[PDB]
Every structure is written in C-alpha cells, then in structure tokens.
Design a protein around this ligand. Structure first.
Ligand code: Y4U
Lengths: 216, 215
C-alpha cells in the first residue's frame, strides 16, 4: 500500500465541487499542520498546490482549499474546470519517518455520461490447465470515467501476487475497457473454495466469484 | 513557478550507466540539501529514489546515486535494467515554502529483448451464459515491443463485427499486455463449431481455438 490512504478516483461535471480525502494516523496527518497537496497532469511535472494543510502557493487559484479533521486531510476543488482533470497526491510529515505520501486520486471532469463497468470473470481454460497454468481473467468493459481499481481474493483473503491490470483504453463505443489477470498454479486454483475479482468504479465496488468445477 | 531544468530525454543500454542533471538557482537546488528524485512509470504513482541530495529510502537499490555541485543535482543510474525505463523528476525546496520540480527526464533503456505474446483464449463463463451473454476473451501478455494486431474466426471465417482490443499497456514485468473481447450472443457461440483468436506480433501469429463445452 501507500503510507497515506487516498481514494483512487473522484469525478465532477464542469463548475461542480469535488472533495478528495487523505487519511493517516495521529503520528503523521493528525500530529501536525504539515499536509501538502500536489497536482499532476499525466506525463508532466507535478506542482505543489497546498502546504501546511490550507496554504496556496502564489498563482494557485482560491478554488483549491485544504482542511483537516483529526487524521483526515481534505482538498476541495470548487468550480471544476477542464484543467483540474489530473492526479492529486497528499503528503504529511510523520516526525519519525519524515515525509509520507498518499497513492494519488485521479480527478475526472466528466466529458460524457458516467457508465458502470460490465465485469466478467473467467475461470482457467482447459488448454492452459493442460499447460500447467490456471490464469484467471477479469474483463471490465463499457465504463466511464476510465479509472478503475481491481482487487482479487483467494476465498475471503486479499491476494497480492500474480495480479496485473491493464491501463484502461477507450474502445470503439468511446467507453473504457481493461482486463485484470491473476496467474495461479493449477494447485492454487483446485485447492481453494473460490477466487473473486472486486472492481471499484466511481466510489462503488462490484465483485464476481468463480470456483473449480469437475469439468471445463 | 519556474521549473528546475532537466533534459527531456536520456538513454542507456542494459548494464550501462546514465547520468541526468537537475539545474536550479542559488535559492533552491544551490541553497540547501533538500533535493529529491522520483521515478515514475507512465500511469502509476511515482517512487522516491533519493532525498536530501544523496539518501536512498528503504528498498531502493544502491544502483541509484545522487549528488550536487553548485546549482546542479545529478542522478546516476548504474547497471540499467528494463524496470529503470521511466520518467525521473527532481524537486527542491526554496524560500517561502516554495517547492520546485524539474520538467522530467524520460530515461530509455535501449535494446530491450523482443518477447512473443502468451495467448490464452477463454470461452464464455457459466455466469455470463446464465445472464444471456457469451463474451470471449483473448488475453495477450508478456510481449515486446507493445504493438499487436488481433483477428477472430467463427469456425474458419473472419469475424468482422463485435471485436474490441485494448491498447497494449506496460505491466510490472516491463512487457505489454492486452485483451481482445468478442461480444457474442449465446446463440452465436452455440451455432459455431469453434471460435479462434489470432494474435500477430513482429510478423509472427499465434492462434488459439475454443469450442462450446460438453460438461
Ligand atoms: C510516493 C512519493 O514519494 C510521492 C507521491 C507523490 N509525490 S509528488 O507529488 O511529490 C510527485 C513527484 C514526482 C512525480 C509525481 C508526483 C511523491
């Protein structure tokens, strides 16, 4: 994980407000007035937009404001404009391990209607199992905005290793698709009660589960 | 407001060294030892590789070394590996709570090894078939460089409708992955002897075939 917790994505339409949060502990976010926020347009240098929870550097419009309540800092962007479409990171001093960062929130300025993802979960194919592979694929299509977070479970347990998710890409219908794949051994696949794919889009999570069958 | 100065690009072959510079002013880079370097893979959070000019955080290999002379910080990456191919940003605090960032250097690791796609074709899931859907997925992973073409067959005949292929994306092994998905009805899927996914990469084609289940 990242050391501070940010929600992976947030969205608004032009001229609306968005608040994104940054959660730590009493020793980092809640121990001082040291929260910073940074804005990054993809493939461009990031920029500091807030320091000391609330302070705007020269040239940052007052549409951006920062606040904090105990262990959670918040950035509010009022009057969303096209240029506000970017990734936002927070940071806190932690005293003991110096500077701690969140994992970034992708903020989308809605360019089209919101669309919830179609999630399909494929158990291992016969051919790959005869090749000693039990890779599962979680197909995620037809969503907007193009920001999705994928988690896998082995039974109820988070599974960390063997997960890859493709960078969502705009398809012919102008909505996004991605696939997540989990590279299991046939042993792992057959020996568990189930595997699940959990897909989070626009602050809402969808889950699909598959289990081994006698046949294919 | 002003960026720190980085060259837009640099490069090295595997095992070689690259050195990249970050030029500020006497009031930022030249004014204290608060220079940081970050590594960023496109579409991912950055990783801190150096803080306070020279210091590697936990888990950053000793291949990454940071120095400063006057107003210019330098990062040297030695024994270059595919994973080092990335954008590198420098930062420096100045006066008045200012934080300055470089424009970023894209470091290319030259001559990365060609890799043929692993192709896995999945017939419709039980769940989607119960929901009156028969989408097939052709998973395409572990290929390099990141350009593939995908054609589908229904029995031996070209499929001209219903195909989406995602734009290849670099995964954590530094090789490309994509999925092709064919949106069939349960009727289309069951009315054919098989469906085939043909993946073309660097003039070479891999074909996989699936058929309605007998279970
Ligand atoms: C984990 C870590 O150290 C992080 C996370 C965000 N940032 S940054 O906002 O200074 C940034 C630096 C370089 C490129 C993009 C953003 C640093």
């Amino acid at each position: 994980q990242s050391a501070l917790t940010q929600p992976p994505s947030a969205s608004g339409s032009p001229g609306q407000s968005v608040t994104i949060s940054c959660t730590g502990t009493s020793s980092d976010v809640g121990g001082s007035d040291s929260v910073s926020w940074y804005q990054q347009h993809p493939g461009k240098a990031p920029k500091l937009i807030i320091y000391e929870v609330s302070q705007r550097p020269s040239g940052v419009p007052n549409r951006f404001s920062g606040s904090k309540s105990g262990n959670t800092a918040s950035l509010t962007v009022s009057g969303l404009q096209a240029e506000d479409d970017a990734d936002y990171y927070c940071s806190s001093y932690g005293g003991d391990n110096n500077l701690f960062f969140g994992g970034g929130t992708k903020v989308t300025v809605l360019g089209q209607p919101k669309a919830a993802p179609s999630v399909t979960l494929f158990p291992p194919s016969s051919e790959e199992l005869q090749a000693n592979k039990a890779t599962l694929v979680c197909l995620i299509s037809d969503f907007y905005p193009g920001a999705v977070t994928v988690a896998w479970k082995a039974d109820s347990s988070p599974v960390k290793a063997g997960v890859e998710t493709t960078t969502p890409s705009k398809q012919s219908n102008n909505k996004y698709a991605a696939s997540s794949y989990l590279s299991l051994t046939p042993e792992q696949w057959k020996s568990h009660r189930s595997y699940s794919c959990q897909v989070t889009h626009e602050g809402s999570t969808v889950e699909k589960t598959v289990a081994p069958t006698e046949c294919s």
